[PDB]
Ligand binder design. Sequence first.
Ligand code: PMR
Ligand code: SF4
Lengths: 431, 264, 262, 402
Amino acid sequence: MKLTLWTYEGPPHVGAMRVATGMTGMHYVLHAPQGDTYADLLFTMIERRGKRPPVSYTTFQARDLGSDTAELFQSACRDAYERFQPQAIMVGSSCTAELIQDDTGGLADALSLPVPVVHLELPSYQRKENFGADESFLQICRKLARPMERTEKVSCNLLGPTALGFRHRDDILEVTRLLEGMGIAVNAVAPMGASPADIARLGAAHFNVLLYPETGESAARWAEKTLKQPYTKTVPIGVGATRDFVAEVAALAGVAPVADDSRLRQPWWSASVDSTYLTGKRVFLFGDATHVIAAARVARDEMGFEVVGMGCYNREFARPMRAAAKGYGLEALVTDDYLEVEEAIQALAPELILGTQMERHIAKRLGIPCAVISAPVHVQDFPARYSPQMGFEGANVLFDTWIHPLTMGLEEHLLTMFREDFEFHDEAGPS
Amino acid sequence: KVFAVYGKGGIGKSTTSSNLSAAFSILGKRVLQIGCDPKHDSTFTLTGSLVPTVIDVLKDVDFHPEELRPEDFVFEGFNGVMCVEAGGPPAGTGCGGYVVGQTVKLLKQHHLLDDTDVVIFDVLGDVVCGGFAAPLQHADQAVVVTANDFDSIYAMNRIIAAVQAKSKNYKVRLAGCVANRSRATDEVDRFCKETNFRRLAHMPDLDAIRRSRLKKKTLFEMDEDQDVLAARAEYIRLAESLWRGLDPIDPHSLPDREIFELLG
Amino acid sequence: AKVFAVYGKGGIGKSTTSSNLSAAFSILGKRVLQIGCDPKHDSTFTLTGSLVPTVIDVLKDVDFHPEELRPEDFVFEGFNGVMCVEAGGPPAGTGCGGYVVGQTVKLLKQHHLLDDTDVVIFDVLGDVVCGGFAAPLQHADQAVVVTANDFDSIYAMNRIIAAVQAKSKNYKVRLAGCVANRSRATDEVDRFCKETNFRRLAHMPDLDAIRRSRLKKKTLFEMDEDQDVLAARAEYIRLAESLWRGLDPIDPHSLPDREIFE
Amino acid sequence: RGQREVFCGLTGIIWLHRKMQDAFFLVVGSRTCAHLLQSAAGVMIFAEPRFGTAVLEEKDLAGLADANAELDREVDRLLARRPDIRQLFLVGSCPSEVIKLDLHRAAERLSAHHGPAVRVYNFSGSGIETTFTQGEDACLASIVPTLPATEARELLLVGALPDVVEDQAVSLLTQLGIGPVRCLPAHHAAEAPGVGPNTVFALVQPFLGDTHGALTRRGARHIAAPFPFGEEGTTLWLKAIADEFGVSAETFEAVTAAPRARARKAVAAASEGLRGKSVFFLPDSQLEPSLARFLTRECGMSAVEVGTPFLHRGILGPDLDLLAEGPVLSEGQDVERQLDRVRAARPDLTVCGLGLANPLEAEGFTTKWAIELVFTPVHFYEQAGDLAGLFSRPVRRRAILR
Ligand code: PMR
Ligand code: SF4
């Protein structure tokens, strides 16, 4: 269909691995040809996970005959069982494993695994990595979670975080700090830190908190229906959104909406004579839909940036994005290829391209200030420092990370403007 | 427990599915009224909403993913928690090409697994066309509905043989040919003996149930039921007889061309 | 010859309309070739008393050869000289739905019965209108829309009209008008035809008189009952007179915006 | 049998497109191989690379002819956007093999339809046949049949090596009284070297197994010479080549005397941290034994397990002959046992795969991440102490951080 050199999302099985390795005691036994191991490298190196990603690969080098591949998958299931001792097993098929005729769950049941085995369907040719993560989450919630008694203290569930997320670690620290400072405890952050036991306990929290909608929204809906746990909707990225999120979780839990804004530096700093040059700067906004909508609110309100184009790479969340874009006077640019993004930036000629890894590079080729506000990123954008995005400290981060490229440009452009690079023009009266 | 509600008439066999949904909602179990009949008359008879939205054509959005939520396409309306109607894109609505439209297939691959108590499967309107027999893939307790008209009972027998045709691997059972006769026709009785099927809740008519109008409602939600309790009588019992396939009267349809029973 | 696309919803008056319209075509003295698609074999069987063998009947007795499709057996000639073929729907599960009727038409043309006759009245189903199922519409020149008089049936005829516009891709098939399956003199459809830019020919209700599946074994033009009156049959006679002169070919437009008034 | 960690052969494309320019690689497959190229290239993809994935959606799954037509359309579009292409490559991938979408017949279909200037060739980096470096092997081996023949003693050392090092090698080697060297002066055009009965090819990178077979099919003559990685490897390689081409050793001793001195001095300077450290040569790239002989002898190392995905003893026997037969080799690859052997043996330096590198380093193991040596210059004299340096790096970093 197309020559894809840049693909924002990855294959569905990669998202399934995100969820699997996010958990503690969950093996993702995956049917896959020899070589499809490469994603373990992504997890090991980009995110720098000490322990190897707890996923196995029934690599069929050249016994592609269904009799053989089934045996490899079965053997790998059982081997992953008594090797890594997981409390539950995740089994699915990837790419050619979908092409090869296998019963990805029937065999897993047939081996009579005492630990629960969650059967996964991942259509490897019409879906993407965000879907895959969300669906794997839905599956583990169905299998493991079960309605039980509400905890005595209102417990909020941090639904959504997974591994290899955009700052899915500092961010949950920040959100937990805000929530517990208001008083609500967290029952079990479900992925990016939740044993299958934690998922078993997901039915005791009062009200869910959908941290990252894209990877976890379907689990949130299932929670609302089965577990009867209402889930919040607003993502607290920024200050305005953070206040709204605080009020919303207060209402869902019936508590006071106290906010520790003593850390809030971004409002005051943006409202400073030092940085009034920001007003009237077109910013192009790309990346996954949640982060883009939140960045839209921040750029338009907190910073006074005039947003020129909002696009996303996940079609699954297009409708909210087109709603928002019609809000901001623009039209959404939901796409999947880097070409249309390059064209949109070229035509609109922004001055601050907040976007995914590829938008960063598009910026650098075009000489426009760049920043990263989304999921597709290499190892560099996964920092060691405390760099959340939601919460008040997230607002501070947002401020500095977004302003830093513009300041780089300004002091760069100054050093050019300065006489060291400007002793080339002269005028003598009437020439 | 998928209950494919077959038949010939438009408003017939479609009011019936809504009555099944109402009875099963009274029974409490979640119900999946997927109508998708070309006549916007399947979710109408249960919700009262004649044509809420036809998004199952997916024109405003290009493909399935765009609907981050089911709320746009699926609808609740009344106790029928899931009343959704595809409508079909024939030459009547848009271009169409084949009258398949594969909309039944779109509901097959719709969104995420909203399983609940499987599906009640109003569905249908395909009956037969080579390559336009999609609903057969999820049919599990397919039931054919007929009025007194001989064309309609022929429609039954044809459908039963046709479902046995494709259900070479699906092997859908048919617990009974619940009908929609109006005048207690003994010809349909002789047929039910001939087809060796089960038809107990077939007294539902097109005249006795407020003439099967399109302004009022069905079963519990409409005014004072029907003839005090006539509507409930056959339909609560249907939700206590066919509520599962515990009585699999599934035979071989017509044993040997037992259609030449025109009489008069 | 003079060909009309008669598309029935599936109502019981399919026989009463197709067979007796053809019978009147012959009553005025003209050669008839009725194509009544009814796998139950009722739409045309009454002109011969017994269940007519169509193209499909003999083409079923033999496997795939047309030389044993002899005239009287592959198109049964009915009363008053109505040689009326049928279309026996595909065997349950297998066989393209179109294939059957397509082969009926191709066999009628192979022996050049349409040229042999002066009538080609083309009664085909209107409930399932897939490309193959709606293929018979293209062959015919004019079109009359036989139907019951209720809102289920008006939706059915709008589906028929949609199939007509779909087959309008091929040639320039027209629509003579709309008639009933002996149900009512278009009190329930005429304003709808006006809505779709069409006319519904005022076909007098004939279901009011005594009727059976196909009026026992011979319909109104082939038995002594003769509907109510010879004028009740002169209704079909005047329809045949219109079908020679072929007035009002105007093609309606599809109406899917709840104009059915279900 | 078991979990294999080696990547698909498409990882060959990553360096193949740079080394053999004017060569586009259509890796027809799924989004999965697309992602693999994405991640592996890392920053190349931004620099307008010469590869890409022709994704097979469900639409292009059932109808193989439909997929063929779409692929032809895609190819025409690419060459229109990239007129500079001289040899397109229809490289198959695992989905492509499963769909049995024969790209050979497709290459026949679109050979000269959109211009005979694009010589479309087909190989298969699919993980279902090749293993990592077997990609470049397969690519060049499919190159071989299209190559012309020759009627002179021609030195066909296979050009899978960085142009700077290649220029160094050809300079010294021609200095050693040798003529045709498959060194196209500009190196920016299709080399099209002649392969005849008197053609003599010298294997340069070990992974090129089927290339050896292909040249043998073309009547070419192999050189059983130790591979030019370190000091003895490069020395024996040059000496062997000199003999077989007909050159004496007298001039050779003077030609590369200074290079030999630099190689030995640099290795002695970089192996200071490398003093009897145990090396577990995990099977990752089938390149291991050639590095091993260097380490164990002239670096002063202690090999434990010099494994390999595949073993081509026909071209490995020379290199192994210098290897001390103590250290075992491995034809059986499964992380389920490889990691256990590593953990039990406690080797001080292990060449794990990248996905195993960080985990293994977390278990008190200095891991030399192996993806470099294929990609970084580690060949010949000047770049032998460099190689020893990258090997001494992990232990020195461990030393600093304790
Ligand atoms: C986790 C997947 C990943 C990423 C994002 C890249 C790019 C990149 N990989 Mg390495 N790298 C991964 C895989 C691969 N890299 C590839 C390329 C390449 C090499 C040769 C090199 C490298 C390295 C890296 C780097 C620098 C950060 C790092 O991963 O350590 C990126 C962004 C880079 C480095 O780490 O050493 C200084 C180094 O020199 N990549 C290839 C060859 C096909 C592989 C298997
Ligand atoms: S036979 Fe198949 S292709 Fe033809 S109209 Fe019917 S469904 Fe469409």
